[PDB]
Design a protein around this nucleic acid. Structure first.
Ligand SMILES: Nc1ncnc2c1ncn2[C@@H]1O[C@H](CSCC[C@H](N)C(=O)O)[C@@H](O)[C@H]1O
Ligand SMILES: Nc1ncnc2c1ncn2[C@@H]1O[C@H](CSCC[C@H](N)C(=O)O)[C@@H](O)[C@H]1O
Lengths: 177, 285, 284, 187
DNA sequence: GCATGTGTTCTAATTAGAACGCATG
DNA sequence: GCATGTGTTCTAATTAGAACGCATG
């Protein structure tokens, strides 16, 4: 189980990379408007690709991140004969409205899963081929309280405790420590 | 050798089925022509003028990658997404990412699905059209989502109207110099009904809006008829675009309902030049 | 000695139906002079016949000297407005007021155009109007033209009822009608592709749209994609026997076109009545 | 056109429509008082051969009913019906005797009712006055009527009289005098 | 018998032209 | 400099909907 090469886009995942168990060998892109295939390709082969919408409060269209995430993920996919397991996920700061919601799921051929932080508190919708986030049922929540969570949270912050908890089951594939 | 096979076409945002009309005018055989469209006026035109050959599949966001695999393989994928939220003529343009602009990504999405998997060197062609009066960034974003840069072809070189349009795609020779021919009506006079005098040789770009027919800032009626000036009739706009006369004379459509359809469509002679190289790849008459 | 091309005067020409059938019968036309005032009417005839028609404006401005100058005429045809004669109008002003009196302009010009006594030169005339008129208005018109009319309903040669009276002297004017192999007698043969007809024939098409709606409960004539629809004007042109897209000129709406169609003649009816004229004049 | 000596002039044969004029023909002697004149007033069913077998006619006269209420037909009806039977009585080209006709309006026809009259009789009318006692409009091929230039009268002046008999003879029998020279006079 | 009809005059639906408004080449 | 445009909102002016009608076969 060799190490992991993973593209992070829009979010520097260097905060919880080390903590979960995974010079450096991570690539992180900021403004992808000038990225092409050759750029992603020369950046070495990867085994997961992560994209994130910015936390609420701050900038530019919320679906801009999804589309730009979609085009880079296709750039980073391997040949269907490659064996090394390939993974990916976009994650949602509950920023996308109902219209942007269906676009994201139609473009990734999967409906999201909404994680809770109730001890409610915070929540995030996330699409990913990881077979464990679809496997793992978390406490069921609403969109009413989720829509009641946005207007309050906006009036004033990446909650990656939920994210670390999310992409934890990705270590069966790569070395720990 | 193996014999050339009829063409299989997926057309997104089909409109008044200009693509099929051009394929037929070139003798190219078409086994299936799958159109995605929502405007009932547009579907009526295509249903009537092509006698129901077209398989209409509705909203393009209803088309899934499963469907592309089942209805395929496709040899040609063509589309022209709405530009009401894209071209700088609309002060309230909502941009590429909201409104009707984001519909372009459905084309980018379905194009990816119909592409042959790696290891399949079968001929595969695609074309995407939109205006040039778009923002600089939305032009580059589209070019970066399609991974190619556009060619601008002005219908002015083959018709009686200006129409600077961008064309993305891989059609053979789709950058070769456009040349006029016998069949192209370069002069406005050759598109008028009898007894009407053309004032100019070319007309500025024709949109859905009525008074895009008067030239200049000063409202120049382009035609004299009897003792009065006049605007272009519906029949004559069809001729300026290169359609058959009365193509859009369906379903009691007003002359404005017809100008909506024409104003959004393609210049037929331009599409004819872009499609003409396909004659050497698929069965003809 | 040799057959000579025909010289025609058409009063209340409308959309030049009379020229349409003289052309489709191979009859060569020397001149076709039309009196008409509707500019939509004139535009159809101007476009659809390439400026062949000599337009002369209001019929009440046609003098005898004009008829002598423009003539001689071998054929005189017309159908004057019936909107003051048709009982369908509750406010009909009659034959002697409104536009009913426009019939006498026809009777006037027909008299002016008749050849002098002893002039055996062939000369034909035809006058059409509606059957749903007053019995006294019918009596007076036949008295003023000195001949009784023949009733012909276009349903025998088309997919539409259209009972009309025809005054005239053309050969065979009351020989019976036989549907030619060319005639479209069913509403289905006039529809555009993908549409199915709820009826075999339709009632008389007037200028108001709701004429297409049939029965006494008011019923659409066509089903398309499980749902019902009215006729399209191109279908209406086919129902009348006109070429399809004949009236598609001058940005006219479908109601503007139905206005022109609703006042016209059924083409096959006129084609039959004009058939024997092929022997009297040069035919190419 | 060209007159004829008195021994050749024979008694006129007249058709009077809408208005009897016999008692207007005795006072100037166009007839014999011992009863050659035909007069119909309801001419709706009058066919042509009816007129022909009514004897050949020399003067066909019609007039709109005077100002009142006996006008049952519409005013223009009298002009068209007159024009209709006029053509019926018109003789052949080589007309041996002279043929005359006249139509008279007693201020009943409106502005557009007069133009169709002048359009159908192919000349503008003449206003014959009895100056402002009365006036009538006259259409006819009598050369003396359209030549002798009468007293001028205004349209506002004719509207008032037409409206004064509304709100409420010999010196206008000047229309028939020039036909003594064409037909026998009776003492 | 009674429904049919080369049409009117009324209501609400478009038509419509004008009025914006400025990046971009 | 400059104007050219796969458009939208609008408000006045038109156009396109539903009832009234009743001789006459
Ligand atoms: N969601 C959607 N799904 C399918 N078609 C759509 C759509 N939204 C808009 N369209 C259609 O996309 C077209 C864009 S204009 C392109 C017209 C076409 N190229 C022609 O030659 O006629 C419009 O006709 C519009 O009706
Ligand atoms: N005063 C006038 N002078 C000349 N034509 C007139 C007129 N008043 C009305 N008309 C015309 O008379 C026509 C009566 S409907 C007759 C149309 C013709 N028979 C056809 O088959 O098309 C109308 O087109 C109308 O425009």
């Amino acid at each position: 189980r060799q190490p992991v090469r993973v593209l992070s886009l829009f979010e520097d995942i260097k905060k919880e990379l080390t903590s979960l168990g995974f010079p450096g060998q991570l690539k992180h892109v900021v403004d992808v408007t000038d990225t092409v295939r050759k750029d992603v390709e020369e950046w070495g082969p990867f085994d997961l690709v992560y994209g994130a919408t910015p936390p609420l409060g701050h900038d530019r269209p919320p679906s801009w991140y999804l589309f730009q995430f979609h085009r880079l993920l296709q750039y980073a996919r391997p040949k269907p004969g490659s064996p090394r397991p390939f993974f990916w996920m976009f994650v949602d700061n509950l920023v996308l409205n109902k219209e942007d919601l269906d676009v994201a799921s139609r473009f990734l051929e999967m409906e999201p899963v909404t994680i809770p932080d109730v001890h409610l508190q915070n929540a995030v919708r996330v699409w990913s081929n990881i077979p464990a986030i679809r496997s793992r049922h978390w406490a069921l929540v609403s969109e009413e309280e989720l829509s009641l969570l946005a207007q309050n949270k906006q009036s004033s912050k990446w909650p990656t405790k939920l994210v670390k908890n999310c992409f934890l089951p990705l270590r069966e594939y790569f070395k720990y420590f | 050798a193996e014999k050339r096979k009829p063409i299989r076409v997926l057309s997104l945002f089909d409109g008044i089925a200009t693509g099929l009309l051009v394929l037929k005018d070139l003798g190219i055989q078409v086994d299936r022509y799958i159109a995605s469209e929502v405007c009932e006026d547009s579907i009526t035109v295509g249903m009537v003028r092509h006698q129901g050959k077209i398989m209409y599949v509705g909203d393009v966001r209803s088309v899934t990658q499963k469907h592309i695999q089942e209805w395929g393989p496709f040899d040609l994928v063509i589309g022209g997404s709405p530009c009401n939220d894209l071209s700088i003529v609309n002060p309230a343009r909502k941009g590429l990412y909201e409104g009707t602009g984001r519909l372009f990504f459905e084309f980018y999405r379905l194009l990816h699905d119909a592409r042959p998997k790696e290891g399949d060197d079968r001929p595969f062609f695609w074309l995407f059209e939109n205006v040039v009066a778009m923002g600089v960034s939305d032009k580059r974003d589209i070019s970066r989502f399609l991974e190619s840069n556009p060619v601008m072809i002005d219908a002015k070189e083959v018709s009686a109207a200006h129409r600077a349009r961008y064309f993305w795609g891989n059609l053979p020779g789709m950058n070769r110099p456009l040349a006029s021919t016998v069949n192209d009506k370069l002069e406005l006079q050759e598109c008028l009904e009898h007894g009407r005098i053309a004032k100019f040789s070319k007309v500025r770009t024709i949109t859905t809006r009525s008074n895009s027919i008067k030239q200049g800032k000063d409202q120049h009626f382009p035609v004299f008829m009897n003792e009065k000036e006049d605007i272009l009739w519906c029949t004559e706009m069809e001729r300026v675009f290169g359609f058959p006369v009365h193509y859009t004379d369906v379903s009691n459509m007003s002359h404005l309902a017809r100008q909506r359809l024409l104003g959004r469509s393609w210049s037929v002679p331009v599409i004819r030049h872009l499609f003409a190289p396909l004659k050497e790849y698929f069965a003809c008459v």
